[PDB]
Amino acid sequence: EVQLVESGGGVVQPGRSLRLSCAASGFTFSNYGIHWVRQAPGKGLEWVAVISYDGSHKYYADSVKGRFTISRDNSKNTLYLQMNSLKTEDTAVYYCAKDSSAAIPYYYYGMDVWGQGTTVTVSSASTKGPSVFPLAPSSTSGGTAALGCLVKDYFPEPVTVSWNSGALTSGVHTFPAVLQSSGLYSLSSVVTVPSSSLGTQTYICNVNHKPSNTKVDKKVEPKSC
Amino acid sequence: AIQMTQSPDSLAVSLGERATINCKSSQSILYNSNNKTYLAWYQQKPGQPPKLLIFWASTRESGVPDRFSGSGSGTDFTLTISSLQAEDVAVYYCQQYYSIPLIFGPGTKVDIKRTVAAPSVFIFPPSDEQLKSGTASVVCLLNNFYPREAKVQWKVDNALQSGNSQESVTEQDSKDSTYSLSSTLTLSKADYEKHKVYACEVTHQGLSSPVTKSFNR
Amino acid sequence: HHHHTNLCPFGEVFNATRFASVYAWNRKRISNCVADYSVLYNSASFSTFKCYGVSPTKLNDLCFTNVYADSFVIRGDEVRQIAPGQTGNIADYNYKLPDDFTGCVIAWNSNNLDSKVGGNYNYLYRLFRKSNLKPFERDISTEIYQAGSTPCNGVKGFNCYFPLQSYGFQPTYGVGYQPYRVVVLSFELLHAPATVCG
Ligand SMILES: *[C@@H]1O[C@H](CO[C@@H]2O[C@@H](C)[C@@H](O)[C@@H](O)[C@@H]2O)[C@@H](O[C@@H]2O[C@H](CO)[C@@H](O)[C@H](O)[C@H]2NC(C)=O)[C@H](O)[C@H]1NC(C)=O
Ligand SMILES: *[C@@H]1O[C@H](CO[C@@H]2O[C@@H](C)[C@@H](O)[C@@H](O)[C@@H]2O)[C@@H](O)[C@H](O)[C@H]1NC(C)=O
Structure with a gap:
């Protein structure tokens, strides 16, 4: 009865900004750290970012370092990801993955709950029917x-x-x-x-x-x- | 960065047989101060998010069947499915969380091992409606084959073509456990009318020799 | 109105109003009474009833020197840790059972009791600790935990965390995160020839 719901995905021109959000329920959200893991179409899982159970520790992937900004709001049970200077190589599905215990360097217990995942497309293109x-x-x-x-x-x-x-x-x-x-x-x-x-x-x-x-x-x- | 490597990349195994997936890390994931290897195993089916199976390399997650087991310490790890079920067909990733960045493996695809099956081969000339636009699309269909591995070769006037074709593959069928493939050869209307014979050569394990279906414009 | 031939007050432990937090688990010595465990094993109100070292039918005709009853509250997904040779947040840092545990474990869902609408923050658990607990060890210390290189000096800070965390039980949670009350009966059988007791 616990679930994570991603949100905010869509189409974005290259270089533009877009903010994703993930809402959690069914468990005490402020006790566990959360991750962002993305997946290119037809490619393996890639880890993006993580934030501790209080916001103190935030680490990012080398491919998105300094371009992404992770944050959370334990009062509203919501976590965010702020993407800027998007590339076509950032086009993927973005899952938020709840960790099993906080997120201090040596307290990563793996991620047990995952969301359905929202989709992010980065391309210089317009809406066209088939x-x-x-x-x-x-x-x-x-x-x-x-x-x-x-x-x-x-x-x-x-x-x-x-x-x-x-x-x-x-x-x-x-x-x-x-x-x-x-x-x-x-x-x-x-x-x-x-x-x-x-x-x-x-x-x-x-x-x-x-x-x-x-x-x-x-x-x-x-x-x- | 701790690089994760999985072997094999694909393991087709019959049901009730044992499936073995391996995972090697570039550095040791075993923490000294608590004797805990920071290694995990994830299962991802099409259209679904990943699912945690094993963490601490050997501890099975709450709700995971007993046929899933993890082993190994330090750098060499192994997820073992003792008796493969029909529901276990998915992509399995190993992931390290010792130090940052957290890094996954390339993934291992697991499908059930039925007997070999040759594909039904079809070829579709471009529609008269599409030639009215200026672009031609020659489609080549491979229907219900096994295993997934195949090779499509386009030859326009026997001249082997490359860089002008994209492909699609379906997931393993839930009933007969066969894949299907769609290849699209795209040319301009000018370069299309410059030739006559259009074929696609299919080489596959179920075919004793490469099979070719063609048409004349 | 009390005698030695009386019946043990098992109601005080199981049917208690409030339960201890897991990190500060409450132990009661059951003493100077007639223990009739038939009240427990013939009751379909428990969701987990597993004994280790003894057959639950053999409980009424054994000879004990000390009987202890430990009560506390945890999550559902953590009840699997109230058993010998387990690991996790509860077995390593809160309540550890020995490998030669000779007793019983009785758990039951208490979501209708230990969960409040905005979150019952009275039930806590130890999240950080240097070394693992010994069996039946109890750590009620609230000293700031040092996860970095520099000392903390009893002050919450960067790499300086408070070691206890609250469950925050709300009824809307999944069963894996709902409050479960746990009673842990520990036994000490007396050394005797079989001719004496068994
Ligand atoms: C725990 O209590 C239940 C029921 O307790 C209620 O409150 C008590 C203070 C007392 O006043 C009971 O009468 C209340 O019903 C006990 O279960 C009952 O057991 C009797 C037989 O002894 C039976 O006739 C009732 O139908 C039972 N009621 C229910 C709801 O099961 C239970 O035995 C107590 N357990 C322990 C370990 O003390
Ligand atoms: C160290 O741990 C051994 C077993 O550990 C478990 O299995 C290995 C493969 C790792 O995955 C580890 O994380 C698991 O918990 C014990 O058999 C051994 O006695 C332990 N030794 C010490 C000194 O702690």
Whole structure:
């Protein structure tokens, strides 16, 4: 029944500032130190900062030293992280990790409670909806052909791709997005069907992109020559 | 800074079999004045935050199953899962907290070891709608294969292409325990019409020889 | 109205109004009475009941020279430390049981008693200490703990911390952090031939 809730993440231009906050409940917040640990997309965990159970000791990572500022407010049960001069290498998910006992050099007992984590994107880019292009199933395999939608060029994350408005679910693979050199993302979502029903079923993907109020439906059909 | 190293980087092991993950630190994490090694083990599943399994190198955290055990002292450490369950498929990190900065390992990916499975290979020419924009996207799909390791090779007019393709891989499927891969070859409309044959060569353990699917523009 | 053939006042210890803090745990010597442990082991109101060195059924037909009852309050996640050969904030710095502990451990959730709305700061625990506690050692000292290079001189400062911390029990906490009352029965069986007692 104890939980840490991150907050304040979003999109920020390179070099600009942004302040994250993490709210704790269910335990005496003023008895334990808290950490910040970030995680780049598809990369390992990286430790960021820590603050003792009173604010006396604050230490930072060599990659964020002098750019970040950790602080807490034991009266409001909240901890903060002040990020300045952000880089695209700072784009990651930021978790607050409760320690097991204070945070004086030799009293780090490891971090037992973690938050869901808020996301921070640092890129010189604007809000753009996606272009949904079909992936036609031409002349396949041994009775199982595939089709899909190409959700290309959008910012920022994320997108939700449903098939037939939630009906078609089995054999569906929505792939994680990739960041292009243009600063925009690209994502493909496929589905494998038996080759015998390729016409007997009109296939439609529903692309939803809340950042730009974009809901696009695209009908996929076998290509005609 | 105390550098943490884990071996192996990926350990696919069948269920009920034992999984062994190792962790070596550059400096000794054993504190002299209390005989306590400041080493921890974390488990991170997709979409979830990490979870503390072991601290003090050998003490199991409240609520962790008994199949999780840690061992080692000083510089060499080991997290052992005696009988791997289907729910234990995650990424495992070791972390030192002796001195600052606190530093994690590179992580070890653990998946269940099913029998080998070759991928279904598909190729998708760019949509007529996309060519109306000036950019072409040739997609190459690898469907339900195992293990995760593979190699995608783009060849436009037999000329092997590189630096012009990005890939995506799905997590291990919850039912048949297979991965899938999406490769996107992006070219300009000009460079696309300059050629005819577009293929992607898939080399994988389940394929006795490299398989190639192609199309002519 | 008291005799030696009377019954031991186990109510005074278990059903007590207030309980001691763990760092200053309260010990009572149960003496000059008939100890009938059937009142305890036939009661489904305890959440932890583990004996070490004795079968709980053998308690009523054994021969003890001294019986002690230790009471205190801790967190849920700390009750696992009230056992021989454990480590943590409670076993190392507050209440340490010996490896050859010959007794019983009885715990139960008291969130409806030892937690107040804004946080019950009457229950404390020792957070810092130089060396570990000996078994059944008691450290009620509130001397400033020196975590740095320079002395502290009895003054809270940088690298100079007060050693006791409060739990701050509120009812909204998780069970791992709710107040649990603990009674620890310690025994000293008399040396005798089996022909005498057992
Ligand atoms: C601890 O107390 C409970 C109940 O205590 C209440 O307050 C006491 C001061 C006394 O006045 C009791 O009558 C109150 O009910 C004891 O449990 C009771 O035991 C009797 C048998 O002796 C039984 O008839 C009742 O139903 C029980 N009530 C409950 C709520 O369990 C318990 O025995 C006491 N334990 C110790 C170790 O003293
Ligand atoms: C030192 O500790 C030994 C066991 O310690 C435990 O296991 C090792 C691997 C570390 O992880 C440590 O943190 C654990 O607590 C004891 O067997 C040994 O007797 C101890 N010796 C002294 C002198 O304290």
